[PDB]
Every structure is written in C-alpha cells, then in structure tokens.
Design a protein around this nucleic acid. Structure first.
Ligand code: MG
Ligand code: MG
Ligand code: MG
Ligand code: MG
Ligand code: MG
Ligand code: MG
Ligand code: MG
Ligand code: MG
Ligand code: MG
Ligand code: MG
Ligand code: MG
Ligand code: MG
Ligand code: MG
Ligand code: MG
Ligand code: MG
Ligand code: MG
Ligand code: MG
Ligand code: MG
Ligand code: MG
Ligand code: MG
Ligand code: MG
Ligand code: MG
Ligand code: MG
Ligand code: MG
Ligand code: MG
Ligand code: MG
Ligand code: MG
Ligand code: MG
Ligand code: MG
Ligand code: MG
Ligand code: MG
Ligand code: MG
Lengths: 58, 188, 142, 126
RNA sequence: UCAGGGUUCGAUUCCGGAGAGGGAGCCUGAGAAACGGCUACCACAUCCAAGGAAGGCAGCAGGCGCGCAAAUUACCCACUCCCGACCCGGGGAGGUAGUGACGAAAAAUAACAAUACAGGACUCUUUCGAGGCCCUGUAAUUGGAAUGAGUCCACUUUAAAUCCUUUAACGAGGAUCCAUUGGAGGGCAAGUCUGGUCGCAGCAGCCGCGGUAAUUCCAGCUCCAAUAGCGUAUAUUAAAGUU
C-alpha cells in the first residue's frame, strides 16, 4: 500500500498491456453449425471412464 | 388514424423453457447437422407446426364419432397431411396423426429433396444451389430452401433453363478465365 | 377446517377472497398507493438527475471495500438518492454538477449485494453511456 | 428467341365502347417488354391500329419470363379521347396537364378570398 | 398469458359517448347550445399613430416546455369515397414518398475436387506390416468453377417518381466484399491455462469470490450459448396448490 489505498481504478491502472494476437477469420451461419456437428458427432475417439470437456486444459 | 392497412401477423416459433439442457442441446444439434439447417429457430419452427397439428388432431379426437364437425375437419386435416406425403394413404385416420415425428416434415423440405433426389453432392451443396437460383420446380425458379414440396411436385424438380448446370450460358468465371485466352493472355 | 360449499354462497366466497387479498404483500403494495408515492422515481424505469458529490459507502462486515457511490438529486421531483457507479475506475468519468441518468438495481425495491442503503446505479454520465467510456468506444465531450 | 402474346378473360364492352382483356407476355429472354412494342402486336392480332390500344400495369414474375398486364381496345379515337383517364392519354401526347403546383393554387385562392369585386391583383397580377 | 379453472390489460385505426383554454348565453338552420359561428366574464397573449383593433393547432406539417419516453414546415387528387347548381370544381378526409432495430415473415456471410496426415469397416499376413471403400480434421499451394451485396444501360412500376421484379456491362481467394452480444464455481451450457493486484481495486440477481500458489477481480489464449441480433431497468402473466 502506498498512498490513498481507497483510490479508484488502481488495479486496472497498473495492469501490463497485452496486444491481441488474433488472425484467422471465424466461420459464420450454417458453416459454424456444420463445424460444431463434425467436432462432436462424427469426429470422435471414444474411451470408458475418462472425462473430455471441450476446453479441458488439464 | 384510419388507414387502408392490415396488421395481421404472428410468430412462427417458440423458445424452450429450459435454456441450457444438455440433452435438448445435443439432440437439436444432431438435427441441425443431418438436415444442414442454419439456425435452431429453423428447428423450433418445425416443432411449432408439428405441435399445432397435434393440438388440432387431439382436439378433434375427443368428439364423438359421427359428429359432422369432427368428420369434416378430420377428413380435411388427413387429406392435407397426405398432400405433402408425411402420411401413408393406408393409415388416413386421426389416430395415426399422433404418431408423426419432426423428421417427417424436415424430410419434405426442398434442400433435402434436391440432395436426396441426386442433383447435389451434399446437403451443404444443395443449400447453396437452391439459394443461387439453379433449381426449378416446374416452370418456377425457387430461391427458398424451406419450400415444402407437395407430393405430385416430386417428379418435376430439375435445373433452371438459364443456368450453367444445364442449357445455360457459362457464368462470369468461365467467361473471364476463357477471356484469359483472349484478354488475359492475348490482349493482356 | 371449514368453507361454505353451498349453491347460493357466491357472494360470501367472492367477498372473502376480496377481503383477504389485502393480506398478500405484493398485492397491497401494488394496489394501495403508498409505494407509488414513496417511490423516488415517479413509477418510472429510469431518471435523470444532478450529481451533488461522490461518496464512499463502506461494505458490510463479511466483505471489505469502499463502494464509491454518488449522491444525486432528481430533476422532476427534487428528491435526493444515492446511486452506484459500477466498474473498475468509472468514478473518474463523473465530475460534479453534471446530469446523470440512473436506473434500478435489479430487485425492484431493495439493496443488492453487500452495499447498505443503495438501490440504484448510474448508466449514463452525460448523454454517453458508462459502457462506451469503459471500452473507449466514446469519450466525454470536453 | 422472340416475344409472344396471349389473351385471357376477353370481354367486349358495349357500354364504354371498347374491348378489355388480360395480356400475358412470354419472353424467355432479356427484359420486360416495352409498352410501345406490345401495342404493335395487339394491333396486328386484333387487326385495327396501334393508336386505339391502351395497355397498362405490366409486372413480371420472379425468375423472369411470363409477365402480365391489362389491355383496352377502343372502337374509335373519339371514344378513346372520351373516357380514358387523362394521365393515360398523356402517356402518348393526346393530353397535357398545363399547371404548376398545388401550393401555388392554394396560396393564390387564399389571397383572392380577402378582396371583393373585380379581383385584378390575382386574376391578372398574381 | 393459459393442462382444467383463471389473472392482467383495452389512451389507440370498427361501434357508442364527451370536448374544443375554463364556465355561461344565443343567431341561422331539417338538424348545433356549433367554436375552421357570434356575444359577455375569468386566465393568457398580439398590433397601435394609445383613440382603437384582433385571438383560440386535443386538424396536417413545424416550434417551445415537460419529461426515461414518440417522425417531413415533402408530392397528388391517379385509387377509396364525400360535398355542390355539377359526367367538368374542391378535399393535410385519404393516397404516395421520407425518418423508423416498436414489432412480424423469408434468409448472405462458403460450396467442391487433389495431395499430406487421422479414424473406421475390410483383405491377406502366425502376428508386424501393407493395400484398399466412406468420413473428418488439418496445412499447403492450389485447382477450377458458382453466385449475390455494390457500381450501373434500358424497360417495367406510378399522377409523376422511388422500391421490388426483369435484364445487360463490370463486380471474390479469404490478408478482405473481415458478426456481434453476453459468459466459463453452483443454479446453468463452457477452463483448477498463463501474467498482474493481495480483503485493495473490483466481482457478485442468490449462495458466495479477493488478506502473496484467485477455477469467480484486471488482461491474453481457449471454449460455451443465441445469432443480425444480444444485454440491462421497470410494469405484468405462468411458475404460485405462496389467494
Ligand atoms: Mg393481521
Ligand atoms: Mg414486509
Ligand atoms: Mg383455460
Ligand atoms: Mg377505449
Ligand atoms: Mg390519460
Ligand atoms: Mg395517436
Ligand atoms: Mg347507441
Ligand atoms: Mg390547449
Ligand atoms: Mg337548409
Ligand atoms: Mg361552444
Ligand atoms: Mg368541427
Ligand atoms: Mg371568427
Ligand atoms: Mg383550430
Ligand atoms: Mg400539430
Ligand atoms: Mg431534453
Ligand atoms: Mg420510441
Ligand atoms: Mg425529444
Ligand atoms: Mg379523388
Ligand atoms: Mg375532379
Ligand atoms: Mg391524415
Ligand atoms: Mg424480426
Ligand atoms: Mg459480413
Ligand atoms: Mg413500403
Ligand atoms: Mg467476447
Ligand atoms: Mg465478466
Ligand atoms: Mg477470465
Ligand atoms: Mg454460471
Ligand atoms: Mg456446468
Ligand atoms: Mg498471483
Ligand atoms: Mg492466476
Ligand atoms: Mg402471478
Ligand atoms: Mg408473494
């Protein structure tokens, strides 16, 4: 703590800036739904017991 | 205030009560993927029409047989359901109407029938064919992938008489890549 | 333990239901007229006012923070309310003697969360929203 | 390819001295046909002339080709100059709507209301 | 909105009533207590040569004020009808264009082959292994087609125009002819991934997160939901068998 601990915008005013790394255009409309169908009903590799959440970092 | 206008309109779908239900979610996505639909509103639409047909059928089914109104409206609903081919002519009674399914109406779409009848290489190819004016139902060019195809109309689907795929002048791509031989390698 | 079932008792049933509806809390609150009078809004969804001065409401015991509310005076009534400025460093966008548009907090009459005595939030600072200033999509006009 | 015309619900009208029918234009081809060409073909079909034949309202269907409108054949040019809504005569020169503007007619009338007797300032001097 | 019963709303385009700043009194007329008529009082307010004169947009546009809150001082009697001495005149009634994410219907934003890898059915091989039919990813150069958004000729449309429809001539390689709004502890679909802050800043409808190893704060990456829409405040209905 250094000076007026009740100051506003403290944490958002000392966060390191990061530029967005983006490039590839995301698909839209029917094309996204077609991709989501493939990615879970026909692109599959099954196992007993294991957990397979779509964003699992573990 | 007085004007010669009409204000009659309605909604054609209903959202589901439970918003995040894994089973409903994946069952509606299976149905979107296998019929190549754009939205889920396009599934809720068919669900709504099927629900209204079921409501009318069950409503007529509680009257006593020999009632003139039940006879008239049942013989009309059955005839109108066979006219699109979602019912066998050998069933034709209000008891079999409560046995239909959502994929009897999604089957009879035009996008489905264009692929299934063999004018396209996938349902995702069929949608862009219909939406690009390549398909003709008798003499009419139909732009709409939701055109519910009647029974007798099943024979007559083919390509538009002014379209590259059958008796048509080639499109703007086959006419600049050909001009490439004249204006892309002969004039520039 | 007893209710009149008989065939000519429609008056008794109707009158008893009409008499007892006045013990339901929300029914009485909506049909009496005291809440529409005591409501700092005139029965409206939003309201414009002038900022008197910013304040530091300290949150309730199981939490610790200083919630940074403002003190507004409403144009149409002249009443003095306390409003909340929700975001990280959004209190810098609100000077003194500038008119702000506030709305409700989300419970229709009550304090939300750990904040005591506050029932509204600020949504517009001067014809420009606190969510366009928070993302840089806009900026204050001076 | 070439244009074709065919006619539907034909009716001879002895009370307005004309013939009226629905006109279908078939044109597998390149644009909805000009009115001036349709009245030629009607003339050579019903064998009169292309100056008593009035056609209107043509609209063409989604996906091109068949196009539909309404046509009239007047038994003379005096009867044709008689009934004939004046805007339709002006489609080929037979009438000319000579005036300026509704607001001028309005504001003039309201100045003429404030004088009595010979209104020289507005029957002549505007 | 609703299983059955009910609950809430109806200033608002059709029928009926009432009013023309507030009251009051009348003329003409078949029909008025008429206000696009008249006469007074009250409240406002305009010009004056100060003697006098003149007023009623809750009609169509427009303006000030009030507010959280609502459009052009446009064109035309061509349609629908009304009035008249009348087949001919007139109509801010009404029709037409403009502003318009109140709200309702249709449905663009990528389709298809090759190669490379991956999976599955299969063939033989003791087995490895290999080939081969379908699909899906994925990257690369491709590879060729297909088309409407946009510019735009003529017709068509209409009172005259616009828009749509019909049509020429141009018009795509994905880096732009670039989809958003909310969230990722539970309720409730989706990450114990990486940096920063350290009971502060902040989040959080509710339970609850933050005190130096934060699944919830600030960001980056990834993922989930609906999608040309999505979030928020309030009124109200079902859930409420908590009337
Ligand atoms: Mg008591
Ligand atoms: Mg209480
Ligand atoms: Mg009911
Ligand atoms: Mg009413
Ligand atoms: Mg009122
Ligand atoms: Mg109104
Ligand atoms: Mg009556
Ligand atoms: Mg007034
Ligand atoms: Mg009279
Ligand atoms: Mg009066
Ligand atoms: Mg009147
Ligand atoms: Mg007067
Ligand atoms: Mg008036
Ligand atoms: Mg007005
Ligand atoms: Mg204002
Ligand atoms: Mg509005
Ligand atoms: Mg305003
Ligand atoms: Mg008229
Ligand atoms: Mg006239
Ligand atoms: Mg009007
Ligand atoms: Mg809509
Ligand atoms: Mg786009
Ligand atoms: Mg329009
Ligand atoms: Mg986002
Ligand atoms: Mg968030
Ligand atoms: Mg995060
Ligand atoms: Mg959650
Ligand atoms: Mg979950
Ligand atoms: Mg840390
Ligand atoms: Mg961390
Ligand atoms: Mg209720
Ligand atoms: Mg209650």
């Amino acid at each position: 703590v250094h000076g007026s601990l009740a100051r506003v915008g403290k944490v958002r005013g000392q966060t390191l800036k990061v530029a967005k790394q983006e490039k590839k255009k995301k698909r839209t409309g029917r094309a996204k739904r077609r991709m989501q169908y493939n990615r879970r009903f026909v692109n599959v590799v099954p196992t007993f017991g294991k957990k397979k959440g779509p964003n699992a970092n573990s | 205030m007085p004007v010669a206008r009409s204000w009659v309109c309605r909604k054609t779908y209903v959202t589901p009560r439970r918003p995040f239900e894994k089973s409903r979610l994946d069952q509606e996505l299976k149905l979107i993927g296998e019929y190549g639909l754009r939205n889920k509103r396009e599934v809720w639409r068919v669900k709504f029409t099927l629900a209204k047909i079921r409501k009318a059928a069950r409503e007529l089914l509680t009257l006593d047989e020999k009632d003139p109104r039940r006879l008239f409206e049942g013989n009309a609903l059955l005839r109108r359901l066979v006219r699109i081919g979602v019912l066998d002519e050998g069933k034709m009674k209000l008891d079999y109407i409560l046995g239909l399914k959502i994929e009897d109406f999604l089957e009879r779409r035009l996008q489905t029938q264009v692929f299934k009848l063999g004018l396209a290489k996938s349902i995702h190819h069929a949608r862009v064919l219909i939406r690009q004016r390549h398909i003709r139902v008798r003499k009419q060019v139909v732009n709409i992938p939701s055109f519910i195809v009647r029974l007798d109309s099943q024979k007559h689907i083919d390509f538009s008489l002014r379209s590259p795929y059958g008796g048509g002048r080639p499109g703007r791509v086959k006419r600049k890549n050909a001009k490439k031989g004249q204006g892309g390698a002969g004039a520039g | 333990m007893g209710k009149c079932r008989g065939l000519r008792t429609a008056r008794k049933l109707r009158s008893h239901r009409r008499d007892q509806k006045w013990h339901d809390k929300q029914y009485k609150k909506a049909h009496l007229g005291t809440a529409l009078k005591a409501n700092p809004f005139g029965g409206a969804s939003h309201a414009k006012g002038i900022v008197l001065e910013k304040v530091g409401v300290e949150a309730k015991q199981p939490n610790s923070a200083i919630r940074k509310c403002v003190r507004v005076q409403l144009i149409k009534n002249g009443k003095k309310i306390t409003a909340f400025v929700p975001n990280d460093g959004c209190l810098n966008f609100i000077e003194e003697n500038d008119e702000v548009l506030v709305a409700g907090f989300g419970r229709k009459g009550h304090a939300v969360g750990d904040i005591p005595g506050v029932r509204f939030k600020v949504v517009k600072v001067a014809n420009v929203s606190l969510l366009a200033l928070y993302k840089g999509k806009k900026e204050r006009p001076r | 390819d070439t244009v074709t015309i065919r006619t539907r619900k034909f009716m001879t009208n002895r009370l307005l001295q004309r013939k009226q029918m629905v006109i279908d234009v078939l044109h597998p081809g390149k644009a909805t046909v000009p009115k001036t060409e349709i009245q030629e073909k009607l003339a050579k079909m019903y064998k009169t002339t292309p100056d008593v034949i009035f056609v209107f309202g043509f609209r063409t269907h989604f996906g091109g080709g068949k196009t539909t409108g309404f046509g009239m054949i007047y038994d003379s040019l005096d009867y044709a100059k008689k009934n004939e809504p004046k805007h339709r005569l002006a489609r080929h020169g037979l009438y000319e709507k000579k005036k300026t503007s509704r607001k001028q007619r309005k504001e003039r009338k309201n100045r003429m209301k404030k004088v009595r007797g010979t209104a020289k300032a507005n029957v002549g001097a505007g």
